[PDB]
Symmetry: D2
Subunit: 124 residues, 4 copies
């Protein structure tokens, strides 16, 4: 993958969450996510995909991943997907927007989904 | 997984896209996605996660998955994440919202992400 | 406005909410919104804008509006914006996606915004 | 309005766009928007609403507004709604997420809406 080395490693967002990911040559993303906020403790499994043959015109590398918020400690009956792009360089970044859906009854489904945006850096 | 059997199988959305998924006992989602629209042809790898121990109060089961839009035929330099919940019953549904991020230059990053909503059913 | 007559009137969404709007020749939208769900009762002021000279190629008419959820009865310290398009015809529709932001502390701002989608029809 | 004075004035986002707004005592927002990017030139009418009696616990003030991208110079057949909160203090901010819907045919409606996030400050 073009940015396999760039993406693999430990990333941190503006909330202090820790995103540990391995990018595979086939376009796979695997790793763990630890949220500094919310109904969460310790690490959760994540899995996703990235464009392993991105454009060479300076564009970023599109990618996404999911965490379901169940582990051996807690279950928040919810999942978040981050959709974004990796931007290489001296200050590499993964810029994302995300959707956090909670399991609800049908009557509460209108209020089932939060939206936000996280920026991940290699430092902090 | 509580809804492992309910989720596993072939699903179709309102656009005619085909979502083929296997839910693992560990919370994994694997399979393929074929979009009826956009810069896409044939099947693409997907991976995601679901809550394998959902609440028993009638709430849905939270889940998400990602497709990076590269396969052996095309590369649209983009990825979509769907975030949603599975609702069991006679007319089972996966109700989602999604984020499609395209790789862009930094100057175009403000217009990098589409948002929408797909409903998947076992029929059609 | 091309769709001034089409847009003006009373609309209803899938939740049973009532959207009463007047489209002005200048592109203004004014009216009231009554939500069937949430921390809301009775009517709330809304204001927005629409494209008063849409394309003539069959495309919909882009529009948006805001409700702040304060009236003489309640204040939910939140606002929703709907962004969408009006589609004319025998079964006219306003198809929207929306963002509901609640006032939060800075520590809770990551969970300040819900996202959803409402479809409005002239009937129901 | 509690933050009538705080909100009224000229704001700038991270793209260099200019948001000129007057907050009314009744909860109204009026003004003009000039986008530094996209199919836009000069000023466009905006209108919205804000919570004129926010909580006093340190929470932000919820607000939203709409721009339809038609003026005397251009018509981009689209509208954006920003939904967010005003945060007062020495470095006052309006933190938003937004939805930009373009008029499309029904066949293209799945790709009608962009999502993003803008932060507005009194400086820059
Ligand atoms: O927090 C969680 C799990 C952790 C989520 C962390 C987020 S991921 C995006 C962001 N980037 C990041 O690094 N960290 C955060 N999931 C919601 C848990 C539902 N709550 C009750 C059910 C409900 C249904 C509908 C609407 C509201 N609630 C439980 C308490 C809670 C916690 C957090 C937010 C809201 N409610
Ligand atoms: O289509 C794709 C891949 C297929 C996406 C299918 C979507 S998933 C959500 C939904 N549910 C579903 O079942 N099917 C659809 N990815 C965009 C491809 C970018 N275009 C140029 C780059 C660009 C950058 C910024 C803004 C706009 N464009 C290429 C042509 C194209 C195709 C579709 C939409 C827009 N542009
Ligand atoms: O309901 C409201 C006002 C009514 C909103 C109705 C929505 S508009 C989109 C949709 N289409 C429609 O026709 N009707 C609905 N506003 C949230 C009120 C905040 N709650 C505590 C604060 C908070 C902060 C952060 C995260 C969660 N909460 C009060 C109780 C409540 C009510 C509804 C949902 C959630 N919480
Ligand atoms: O730009 C505009 C008007 C200006 C929008 C500026 C945005 S507001 C959010 C953000 N904060 C800000 O300060 N500034 C930006 N509106 C789209 C115009 C549609 N294009 C073809 C139709 C189409 C339909 C579906 C999908 C894609 N396109 C015309 C060319 C264009 C311009 C910009 C982005 C994309 N396409
Ligand atoms: Cu290419
Ligand atoms: Cu909650
Ligand atoms: Cu439980
Ligand atoms: Cu495109
Ligand atoms: Cu035109
Ligand atoms: Cu609430
Ligand atoms: Cu109060
Ligand atoms: Cu365009």
């Amino acid at each position: 993958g073009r940015d396999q080395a760039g993406i693999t490693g430990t990333w941190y967002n503006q909330l202090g969450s820790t995103f540990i990911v391995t990018a595979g040559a086939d376009g796979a993303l695997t790793g763990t996510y630890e949220s500094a906020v919310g109904n969460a403790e310790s690490r959760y499994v994540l899995t996703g995909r990235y464009d392993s043959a991105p454009a060479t015109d300076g564009s970023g590398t599109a990618l996404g991943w999911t965490v379901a918020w169940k582990n051996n400690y807690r279950n928040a009956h919810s999942a978040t997907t981050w959709s974004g792009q990796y931007v290489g360089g001296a200050e590499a970044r993964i810029n994302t927007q995300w959707l956090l859906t909670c399991g609800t009854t049908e009557a509460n489904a209108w209020k089932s989904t939060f939206v936000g945006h996280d920026t991940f850096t290699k430092v902090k």
